[PDB]
Design a protein around this motif. Structure first.
Motif, short mmCIF file in Angstrom:
data_model
loop_
_atom_site.label_atom_id
_atom_site.label_comp_id
_atom_site.label_asym_id
_atom_site.label_seq_id
_atom_site.Cartn_x
_atom_site.Cartn_y
_atom_site.Cartn_z
N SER A 56 0.83 -1.20 0.00
CA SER A 56 0.00 0.00 0.00
C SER A 56 0.87 1.26 0.00
O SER A 56 1.68 1.46 0.90
CB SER A 56 -0.93 0.01 1.22
N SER A 59 -0.27 8.30 -1.12
CA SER A 59 -0.22 9.40 -2.07
C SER A 59 -0.09 10.74 -1.34
O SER A 59 -0.97 11.13 -0.57
CB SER A 59 -1.48 9.41 -2.94
N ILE A 67 -3.51 3.41 -0.34
CA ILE A 67 -4.19 2.67 -1.39
C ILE A 67 -3.71 1.23 -1.45
O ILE A 67 -2.58 0.95 -1.85
CB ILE A 67 -3.97 3.33 -2.77
N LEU A 69 -2.97 -1.92 -2.96
CA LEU A 69 -2.77 -2.44 -4.30
C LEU A 69 -3.22 -3.90 -4.40
O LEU A 69 -2.51 -4.81 -3.97
CB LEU A 69 -1.30 -2.33 -4.71
N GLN A 74 -0.36 -5.11 -12.41
CA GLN A 74 -0.28 -3.68 -12.70
C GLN A 74 1.02 -3.09 -12.17
O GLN A 74 1.45 -3.38 -11.05
CB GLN A 74 -1.48 -2.95 -12.10
N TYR A 79 -0.54 3.18 -10.39
CA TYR A 79 -1.12 3.71 -9.16
C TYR A 79 -0.63 5.14 -8.91
O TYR A 79 -0.61 5.60 -7.77
CB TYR A 79 -0.77 2.82 -7.97
N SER A 80 -0.23 5.82 -9.97
CA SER A 80 0.26 7.19 -9.87
C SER A 80 1.38 7.28 -8.84
O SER A 80 1.48 8.26 -8.09
CB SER A 80 -0.88 8.13 -9.48
#
Length: 97
Positions: A56, A59, A67, A69, A74, A79-80
């Motif tokens: 996680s 941000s 966030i 994951l 991916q 995930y920016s």
């Protein structure tokens, strides 16, 4: 390794979510790397299965919010995730559900 142009390496800090005391380290990985690989790399370290390895990232733009994951196929850029961010390695033992 290769260290080519394709994909750049980001500089983040890894910190166990369950183990806060554990000092913080820094690992450089290519944004291309798939969340899965990142989990498999540490899996052998913390002897934890990529399955129980919930990564996680926090941000900056949105503090006090992590966030989880769920997608491994991916990449990190999906995930920016950009240099400076913070990596959080969390894993559960006793399953429930």
């Amino acid at each position: 390794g290769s260290s080519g142009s394709s994909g750049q390496l980001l500089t983040l800090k890894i910190k166990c979510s369950n183990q806060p005391e554990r000092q913080i380290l820094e690992k450089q990985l290519p944004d291309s790397m798939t969340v899965q690989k990142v989990k498999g790399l540490l899996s052998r370290l913390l002897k934890v299965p990529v399955s129980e390895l919930l990564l996680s990232y926090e941000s900056s733009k949105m503090p006090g919010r992590e966030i989880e994951l769920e997608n491994d196929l991916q990449p990190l850029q999906f995930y920016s995730v950009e240099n400076g961010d913070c990596l959080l390695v969390r894993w559960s033992g006793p399953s429930s559900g």
